[PDB]
Amino acid sequence: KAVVPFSEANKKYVSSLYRKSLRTAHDWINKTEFYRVKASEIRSRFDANKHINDPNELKVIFKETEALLEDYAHPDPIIPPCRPGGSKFERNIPPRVEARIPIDV
Amino acid sequence: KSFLPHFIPKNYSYGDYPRLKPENLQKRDPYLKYDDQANKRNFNEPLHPQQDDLDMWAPDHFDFVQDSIALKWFGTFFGVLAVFSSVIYIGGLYPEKPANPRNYPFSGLAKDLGASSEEDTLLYAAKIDKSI
Amino acid sequence: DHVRSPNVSFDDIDYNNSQDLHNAQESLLREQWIRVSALKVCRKALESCYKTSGPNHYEDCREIAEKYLNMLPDHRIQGFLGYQKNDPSK
Amino acid sequence: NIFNKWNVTPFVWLFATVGIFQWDKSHRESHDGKGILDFLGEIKVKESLDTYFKEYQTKVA
Amino acid sequence: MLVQNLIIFNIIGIVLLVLLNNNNNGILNKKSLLTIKNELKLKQIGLIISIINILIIIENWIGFNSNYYGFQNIERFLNIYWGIDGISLLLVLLTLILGPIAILSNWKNLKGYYTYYVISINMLVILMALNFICLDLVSFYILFESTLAPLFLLIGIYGANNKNKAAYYVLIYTLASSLFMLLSIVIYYIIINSTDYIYINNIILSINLQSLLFIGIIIGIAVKTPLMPVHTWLPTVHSESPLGGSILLAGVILKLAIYGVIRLLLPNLSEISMMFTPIIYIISILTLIYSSLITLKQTDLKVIIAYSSISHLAVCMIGIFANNLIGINGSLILCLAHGFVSPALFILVGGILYDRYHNRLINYYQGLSTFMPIFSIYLVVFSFCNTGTPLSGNFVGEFLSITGAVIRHPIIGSLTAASVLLSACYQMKLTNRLTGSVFSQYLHITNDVTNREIFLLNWLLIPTIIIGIYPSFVTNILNLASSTLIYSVLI
Amino acid sequence: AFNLQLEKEIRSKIDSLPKLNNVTNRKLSLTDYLFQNAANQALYVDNEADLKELDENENEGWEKIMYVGFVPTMILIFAIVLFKDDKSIDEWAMDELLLRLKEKNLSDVELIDELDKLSKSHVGKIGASEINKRDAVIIERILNGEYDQLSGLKKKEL
Amino acid sequence: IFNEIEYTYNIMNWLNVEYLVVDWSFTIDKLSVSMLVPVVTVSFLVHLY
Amino acid sequence: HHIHTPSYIKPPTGGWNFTPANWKQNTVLVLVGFTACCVGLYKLGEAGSYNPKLKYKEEELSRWNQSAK
Ligand SMILES: CCCCCCCCCCCCCCCCCC(=O)OC[C@H](COP(=O)(O)OCCN)OC(=O)CCCCCCCCCCCCCCCCC
Ligand SMILES: CCCCCCCCCCCC(=O)OC[C@H](COP(=O)(O)OCC[N+](C)(C)C)OC(=O)CCCCCCCCCCC
Ligand SMILES: CCCCCCCCCCCC(=O)OC[C@H](COP(=O)(O)OCC[N+](C)(C)C)OC(=O)CCCCCCCCCCC
Ligand SMILES: CCCCCCCCCCCC(=O)OC[C@H](COP(=O)(O)OCC[N+](C)(C)C)OC(=O)CCCCCCCCCCC
């Protein structure tokens, strides 16, 4: 659809692209000192184009930003163990709380 | 990217059963709320005719690379070893034996390798030590 | 008790006498079950030798291994319908 | 209750079967190798069964 | 004694049950004592007759001699000569044992008319039990086809939503084909002037006429032991028939078709059985592979077990047509082992789940091992037995049948080994889904397996594991009987 | 013990509280199902059916039969396959193989010595087994020569 | 391993179909006991762990 | 915390940290059973086992190979 800059919904999209960018950097870079350096740059690359008042100019970046993430996506992203996709997700789920309705079989 | 698994049809018309584009239920966002959180499905949602092939119980689908690209990398990797094994075979670069193959006394232990008489012998004999 | 086999051949009887024909079928079945029993005994002799000989099992167990592989194809139950209904002489 | 209705039943079958098997093994020594169920009847012998077969085949023919 | 005691007592029992129930009909409305507790007294008398039928045969099992070759217990009743040999004795034992279990399975899950159901179940069991002990093709056919009259009514009266389709399937599939078996029986009566087993075993026919009679008879057999492509009746009937009708239709009726080979094809049509055995293997191997793959795409719970029945019976036919003792003994042990494991699954699938939730769709059931643990132990235990796990009686049957298949034909008979893998595909997928992940959001917590349903399971599992651990109980009876079926001349 | 008035107590105790959907000493006999007349049987229906009305899968009427009639039948089947004196064809063929050794080798003193000292119980385990018994002569004699007449039954050759 | 001894407990017969005879027989040769050290030893510590 | 529904769910292996009140008594009844059977298994193992390398002397085998010849 159309892209309306400075609208609340358009900002959240840019917020989402930011979590994709930094987490992907975190996935590849496994040293904090190296990560902050690259994480600082991405924000600069994210904040340099902060000011846009045009629809069509912004949509090209959205097209480009998706391509940047897809090619750089990690083949084994880090996931917290209890979050979905983690090593301990769904383990030992507490049983459902409900009354046993007896049936006369 | 986000491609659907093989053999899922592009079109179907089963009379009055609803038509709907296939959706790979394994790839729904695991954080969104669902009525059936394990199957990531909401109550009374319609099913594709082959929904059994597009849910959490079907074989896992991996979409990191295209199914053709995987063949190229897979065949190349063994193809690389093929040339490494071929060139040595074609070139004969493997070393020669440093000693004669081990020989054995008593007619190559013919009798001790399950032989009865001297006519067969070579059938059951080992490397004969002709140089006692 | 130990019933004696009715040693009887398909080549000496009239199949119209279904009492004698029954014995010719029962006698051909019982002899075959003896050959399997003979075979299972011979195989037991092979097993002791291999266990006892160890490395020499190829020598001390030579003719038993030869004989066992010779009796194997024919020391099996084959029924009587083959020989009752076929005439080898013709 | 460890000795409740369900746990015990396999052991009742387990111990009883061992006892009767040992009983039957003994009973063969003192009764000429004949088993514990020899009282229920006798195996049919060929001489008795052949008469039935011959009448059956004769009537058939 | 046997058949005479087996018919006269059952007829007396059937008359007794009818007299008790129908006395009060009259002109006035009746609220009698026999209707109280859902015809409970009349159901009990039906259950006792099933137990007594077993006692009749055991009275004659004691007299059985394992070292005598030939039919024993020969008697003439209704101008028909009966008798028992090694093979027939065990199948009779299986048929009568499923009597009490078929009745007990439907103890309190019918809307009414329990007396009619109890009479029909004991009637079907007797007709099938008597089918193993006759000694002519005509009497074989009479008992082979008489079971349609109660089974067609039973499935129609007591069936599921599609009972009319199921009733129209068993009646026509198993009659339009068995009528082809009547033609070959008739031709035996025209040229030989007798259909007795012994009389026709000693005759050789022209190799053209052998091919005609075989084609007629195997048409009637390929439907009862459903071989592709004429298997379409069994999945439908299973998914719609009453639970007790499924135990008999899978436990016994299929095994009447393997016994059909033993009496009607191997002894008298021995020369033409050798010719068709390559073709029989092709049909059965394709039945084994296709039925296993079709099961992977099914949704009804009770259909899924129905197709698993077809894959095992294809293996049984593979073994029995192997011309050796290994294949024949293995095929018969598998029929006995399948005779307990197959009914047990229908109890688990169409008798325990369906009596609580009344829906056979697979999508509603998952995580059942949480609030129904005793159910999931038996589903796991019976899943392995159904797939030839070495300690069960199915592995002994399948391994020997596969071994006998390779002996008969090393090249194509080796493809029977795909039974070990494919049987674990559709079955373990079904069990892994049922007892995996979180408990289903469409079901509601209820009772676990009741005490009656445990009794049914324990006494279908106990015979299965005895035959697995010590199969020589079956073998000591079979060996002299199964050795008369082998055709080979070695010179 | 039909106890016609015992129903009237159930009748009166229910009658005092006619409101519905809101004991142990009752047990019939075979006589009451058939001998009894309709009117006395007519009231019994209401008491029993509606006693449940005012409501764990136990005492369903089958446990008395299956546990007393069906289960002992299985023990009888299990007993028979265990302790029956049925001689299988192959077990017969093992005794027959040895009984021919005695008849075909009556001049052999040593062979008959092992057969004589042998017990009839250990016939089924000739060879390597837990039993401390000597059978080398028995096994050796069978190896040297055949003791079957399968060719003796076949008087026709190619 | 050191004393050159072998053990064989034969519970009973399993399959007795004509010539094919299979026992419930358990033996412990050099190789059987060479594998029972890695199996039972590790598994005991695994259970203790 | 959370509820085990232990009123009815009684699998043979307990369920969700199950421990009976009389667990000390039952274990000694069980520790006997393990001891009763381990002792019992040792008796049968000694009585029913054998050495398959000493049942037949080589002097007896040497006659077998020649007899089959
Ligand atoms: C929910 C399921 C409930 C049911 C589960 C049932 C599990 C019970 C396990 C046992 C299964 C039944 C097998 C035992 C009954 C048959 C015993 C038998 O046939 O023994 C025959 C054996 C040889 O026969 P013979 O020497 O001629 O003299 C015997 C005269 N009757 O005579 C003998 O001397 C044998 C003496 C007995 C030896 C011990 C038997 C132990 C059987 C259990 C272990 C089986 C082998 C190990 C399997 C475990 C995996 C390796
Ligand atoms: C001391 C060392 C030996 C110990 C051996 C165990 C003895 C006690 C057994 C009785 C326990 C019992 O019966 O329970 C165990 C369970 C539970 O069933 P339940 O008890 O009826 O559940 C109670 C239900 N209520 C609430 C309705 C009353 O049974 C089963 O489902 C058994 C399933 C089969 C188990 C695996 C068999 C596979 C065979 C492999 C080996 C041949
Ligand atoms: C061994 C073979 C013996 C021969 C048996 C012949 C069957 C005749 C029985 C008549 C009795 C009767 O009509 O009675 C009816 C009885 C019992 O009905 P109910 O539920 O008590 O009454 C119901 C009404 N109420 C509850 C309101 C009072 O049901 C039967 O008929 C069942 C058996 C026959 C069904 C199939 C017949 C197929 C015949 C062809 C088979 C080759
Ligand atoms: C060589 C033959 C060996 C046989 C010996 C058998 C020992 C194992 C017995 C397990 C019984 C049990 O307890 O299984 C039942 C367990 C119990 O769950 P829990 O941990 O008690 O928690 C209880 C609370 N749940 C249930 C919510 C977690 O739940 C299940 O339904 C698991 C699925 C079925 C398991 C089937 C295993 C059967 C063993 C394999 C048979 C061949």
TrEMBL record, chain B:
Cellular component, GO, one term: mitochondrion
UniProt keyword annotations, A-Z: Membrane, Oxidoreductase, Transmembrane, Transmembrane helix, Ubiquinone
KW Transmembrane helix (keyword) present: yes
Record-listed E.C. numbers: 1.6.5.3
Class of this enzyme: oxidoreductase
Lipid biosynthesis as UniProt keyword: no
A molecular function GO annotation: oxidoreductase activity
TM ranges: 73-94
Protein name: NIAM (ASHI) subunit of mitochondrial NADH:ubiquinone oxidoreductase (Complex I)
Species: Komagataella pastoris (Yeast)
Gene that specifies this protein: niam
Full protein stretch here: 25 to 156 of 156
TrEMBL record, chain E:
Class of the enzyme per the UniProt entry, highest EC level: translocase
Membrane topology, as annotated: Multi-pass membrane protein
InterPro entries (alphabetical): NADH_Q_OxRdtase_chainM/4, NADH_UbQ_OxRdtase, ND/Mrp_TM
Top-rank lineage group of the source organism: Eukaryota
Domain NADH:quinone oxidoreductase/Mrp antiporter transmembrane: 136-416
Residues annotated as transmembrane: 6-24, 45-64, 80-102, 114-133, 139-160, 167-191, 197-223, 243-266, 272-291, 303-322, 328-353, 365-385, 405-426, 454-473
Annotated Pfam families: Proton_antipo_M
EC number: 7.1.1.2
Subcellular location: Membrane; Mitochondrion membrane
Primary location group: membrane
Molecular function, one GO term: ubiquinone binding
Family: Belongs to the complex I subunit 4 family.
Protein's job: Core subunit of the mitochondrial membrane respiratory chain NADH dehydrogenase (Complex I) which catalyzes electron transfer from NADH through the respiratory chain, using ubiquinone as an electron acceptor. Essential for the catalytic activity and assembly of complex I.
UniProt name for this protein: NADH-ubiquinone oxidoreductase chain 4
TrEMBL record, chain G:
Source organism, top-level taxon: Eukaryota
Positions of the NADH-Ubiquinone oxidoreductase (complex I) chain 5 N-terminal domain: 14-49
Signal peptide: none
Sequence intervals crossing the membrane: 31-49
Compartments, as annotated in UniProt: Mitochondrion inner membrane
Function description: Core subunit of the mitochondrial membrane respiratory chain NADH dehydrogenase (Complex I) that is believed to belong to the minimal assembly required for catalysis. Complex I functions in the transfer of electrons from NADH to the respiratory chain. The immediate electron acceptor for the enzyme is believed to be ubiquinone.
Protein family per UniProt: Belongs to the complex I subunit 5 family.
Protein's recorded name: NADH-ubiquinone oxidoreductase chain 5
Region of the whole protein represented: 51 to 99 of 642
TrEMBL record, chain H:
UniProt entry keywords in alphabetical sequence: Oxidoreductase, Ubiquinone
Molecular function GO labels: oxidoreductase activity
Entry's EC annotation: 1.6.5.3
Top-level taxon of the source organism: Eukaryota
Name of the protein in its database record: NUUM subunit of mitochondrial NADH:ubiquinone oxidoreductase (Complex I)
